[PDB]
């Protein structure tokens, strides 16, 4: 009855950031103290991962996606940028954990890996935890686009095209965001020292 | 108008990707974001 954190972090495929994946984790016990080694880079904005083993929650959500290394700093409360605004947005009062690690050897390809995309145009910023997977042509001018890309009519998603020779700031990073939900319901996700 | 220079910048981004300059295409992408974020 252990929590399936292994299927989250060590998964073969990761989603694009514009279509970020959400895995609801419930009805299990997890050892959050071992998450300092679950290569990595992690920061919890609430209590420490040690205190997480003492607490229980109704549901734990794991969000995962791939972005550039220089964009990981946007996966934090109070951030703005292309990713925060148009792709994945954390609330200002976020108290979960953000975990990211370089995935160059898995997600880069000679000639370019064009699977991973991000949204470059949007008419308004995302609300926290909003997801937008639409592919409507963005009309940048006053002339209609009639559903086809052209002058001032841009396909809203852009590919990263990851290549192994990119600088580290441009290499792909797999990111996992853990949010801890306490509802007025049985807290079915507990830690080790609970 | 902002529309002409935006189109030209966008075309440089596309051309860079077609010619294999993917990393430089990403940097031009960041310029597009910052430009449209303005007034």
Is-contact B22 A159, C-beta < 8 A? Answer: no
**Residue A129 forms part of a structural domain:** no
């990595």: which residue's tokens?
A40
Look up residue B27 and give its two tokens. Answer: 């940097």
**Residue A51 forms part of a structural domain:** yes
Is-contact A64 A14, C-beta < 8 A? Answer: yes
């926290």: which residue's tokens?
A128
Breaks (C-N over 2.5 A) in chain A follow: 38
Contact check, Cβ <8 Å, B29/A120: yes
Contact residues for A33 (Cβ-Cβ < 8 A; gap 6+): A49, A50, A52, A53, A191, A192, A193
Look up residue A68 and give its two tokens. Answer: 């550039």
- Domain extent, residue B31, equals 2-36
Q: Domain holding A186: CATH number?
A: 3.30.70.1840
Is-contact B31 B9, C-beta < 8 A? Answer: yes
In angstroms, the separation between the Cα of residue A41 and the nearest Cα of chain B is: 24
Contact residues for B35 (Cβ-Cβ < 8 A; gap 6+): B2, B6, B9
Contact residues for A20 (Cβ-Cβ < 8 A; gap 6+): A63, A64, A65, A87, A88, A131
Is-contact A177 A95, C-beta < 8 A? Answer: no
Q: What is the resolution of this structure in A?
A: 2.2
Best mutation target, A85, A86, A158, A162, to test chain B (most B CBs within 10 A):
A158
Is-contact A33 A192, C-beta < 8 A? Answer: yes
Q: What is the CA radius of gyration of chain B?
A: 10
d(CA A136, CA A148): 9
Which residue in B9, B1, B4 sits closest to A120, CA to CA?
B9
**Residue A33 forms part of a structural domain:** yes
d(CA A15, CA A191): 27
Could you say which of B13, B23, B29 has the minimum Cβ distance to residue A167? B23
d(CA B6, CA B37): 12
Looking at the structure of chain A, the number of domains it has is 1
d(CA A80, CA A70): 13
Is-contact A99 A35, C-beta < 8 A? Answer: yes
A82 Cβ under 8 Å from any chain B Cβ: yes
d(CA A123, CA A86): 9
Best mutation target, B33, B35, B36, B38, to test chain A (most A CBs within 10 A):
B33
A87 Cβ under 8 Å from any chain B Cβ: no
Contact residues for B32 (Cβ-Cβ < 8 A; gap 6+): A120, B6, B9, B10, B13
The secondary structure of chain A, three-state, reads CECCCHHHHCCCCCCECCCCEEEEECCEECCHHHHHHCCCCEEECCCCHHHHCCCEECEEEEEEEEEEHHHHHHCCCCCCCHHHHHCCCCCCCCCCEEEEEECHHHHCCCCCECCCEEECCCCCCCCCCCCCCCCCCEECCCCCCCCCCECCEECCEEECCECCCCCHHHCEEEEEEEEEECCCCCCCEECCCC
Look up residue B23 and give its two tokens. Answer: 């990393």
In angstroms, the separation between the Cα of residue B33 and the nearest Cα of chain A is: 6
Contact check, Cβ <8 Å, A152/B6: yes
- Domain extent, residue A63, equals 6-118+160-190
Q: What residues in A contact B23, CB-CB < 8 Å?
A: 163, 165-167, 170
């Amino acid at each position: 009855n252990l929590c399936p954190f292994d299927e989250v972090f060590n998964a073969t495929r990761f989603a694009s950031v514009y279509a970020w994946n959400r895995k609801r984790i419930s009805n299990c016990v997890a050892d959050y103290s071992v998450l300092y080694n679950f290569f990595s880079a992690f920061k919890c904005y609430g209590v420490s991962p040690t205190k997480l083993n003492d607490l229980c929650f109704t549901n734990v959500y794991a969000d995962s996606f791939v972005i550039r290394g220089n964009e990981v700093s946007q996966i934090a409360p109070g951030q703005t940028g292309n990713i925060a605004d148009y792709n994945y947005k954390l609330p200002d009062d976020f108290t979960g954990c953000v975990i990211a690690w370089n995935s160059n050897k898995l997600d880069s390809k000679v000639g370019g890996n064009y699977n991973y995309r991000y949204r470059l145009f949007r008419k308004s910023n995302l609300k926290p935890f909003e997801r937008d997977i639409s592919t409507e042509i963005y009309q940048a001018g006053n002339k209609p686009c009639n559903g086809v890309a052209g002058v001032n009519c841009y396909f809203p998603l852009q590919s990263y095209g990851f290549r192994p020779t990119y600088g580290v700031g441009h290499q792909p990073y797999r990111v996992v965001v853990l949010s801890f939900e306490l509802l007025h319901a049985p807290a079915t996700v507990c830690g080790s020292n609970s | 108008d902002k529309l002409w220079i935006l189109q030209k910048i966008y075309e440089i981004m596309v051309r860079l990707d077609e010619e294999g300059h993917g990393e430089a295409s990403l940097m031009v992408s960041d310029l597009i974001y910052e430009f449209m974020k303005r007034d």
